Symmetry: C3
Subunit: 89 residues, 3 copies
Amino acid sequence: HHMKLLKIYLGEKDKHSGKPLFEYLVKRAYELGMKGVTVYRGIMGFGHPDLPIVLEIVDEEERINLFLKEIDNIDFDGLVFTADVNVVK
Amino acid sequence: HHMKLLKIYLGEKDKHSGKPLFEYLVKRAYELGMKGVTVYRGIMGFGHPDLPIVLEIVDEEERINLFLKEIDNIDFDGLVFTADVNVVK
Amino acid sequence: HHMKLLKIYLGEKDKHSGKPLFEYLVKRAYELGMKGVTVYRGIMGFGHPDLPIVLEIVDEEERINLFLKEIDNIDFDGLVFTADVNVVK
Ligand SMILES: Nc1ncnc2c1ncn2[C@@H]1O[C@H](COP(=O)(O)OP(=O)(O)O)[C@@H](O)[C@H]1O
Ligand SMILES: Nc1ncnc2c1ncn2[C@@H]1O[C@H](COP(=O)(O)OP(=O)(O)O)[C@@H](O)[C@H]1O
Ligand SMILES: Nc1ncnc2c1ncn2[C@@H]1O[C@H](COP(=O)(O)OP(=O)(O)O)[C@@H](O)[C@H]1O
């Protein structure tokens, strides 16, 4: 059963409306009906103390795409990628 | 050198025989002769304080499959997926 | 936009010139002009307290390859793999 993994990297100090962006992302994920999310905190990072936050979502491609369309209206740096995975039931 | 990544997401409060399921998984992994395992703890998650636990195993497909056959007899929710990776020697 | 994910697993107690190897890796990554790195610490692991350290780099294949050529001169155990991902802009 084919799915996409969506991985989002951002900083903990990143804000949306003064409030933590990663919390806002997890909350949009939930409001959109995503199957789930897992959030990690790193110990070190750089892109281009403010620690990496990483979200992983495994969902149907259509759902990841819908979420991507929301993420688009948000200015943060970090990184977004997807990858194909096979979910086992 | 082709391998599979197997990724398992579960809750920290999940139990097998009253004892922590993630510890039981790591222990089966070891008893089966898996090449390795890495275990992470998240800071937030949801599916469908109890924090996400994630296991990653990179191994031969045959081995991941054998492990899958054990995981099948266990009732937990969470998520299991595999993905192709290329291991460098 | 195709990229590679490079994932490196090593122990926290691993050393390069008496100094922590993971810090040395992150520092080479930066000196080579990698697009970024994210570093995680696990809670448990085995291969074949010394906790897993995991680095993730998402970059152009050419860059990951160049980094691989440096990693080659270093003796540590752990694990290195790559995987194809699609970065969204
Ligand atoms: N190419 C990448 N590979 C792995 N992690 C990355 C990459 N790009 C960004 N990240 C992660 O995202 C975090 C946030 O990125 P970024 O905002 O661009 O800025 P910064 O350099 O100030 O941390 C980084 O610190 C890093 O952990
Ligand atoms: N589709 C998913 N994507 C990313 N992480 C997931 C997904 N599904 C489940 N998880 C992770 O697995 C954890 C355990 O899942 P679950 O048992 O289904 O219940 P819960 O909602 O009570 O946390 C979740 O909290 C989450 O971290
Ligand atoms: N096949 C693997 N799958 C997942 N993680 C691995 C794998 N191989 C190694 N690792 C991670 O790398 C860490 C360092 O590996 P290793 O040096 O080989 O020795 P050790 O058994 O002494 O921890 C492991 O503890 C583990 O977290």
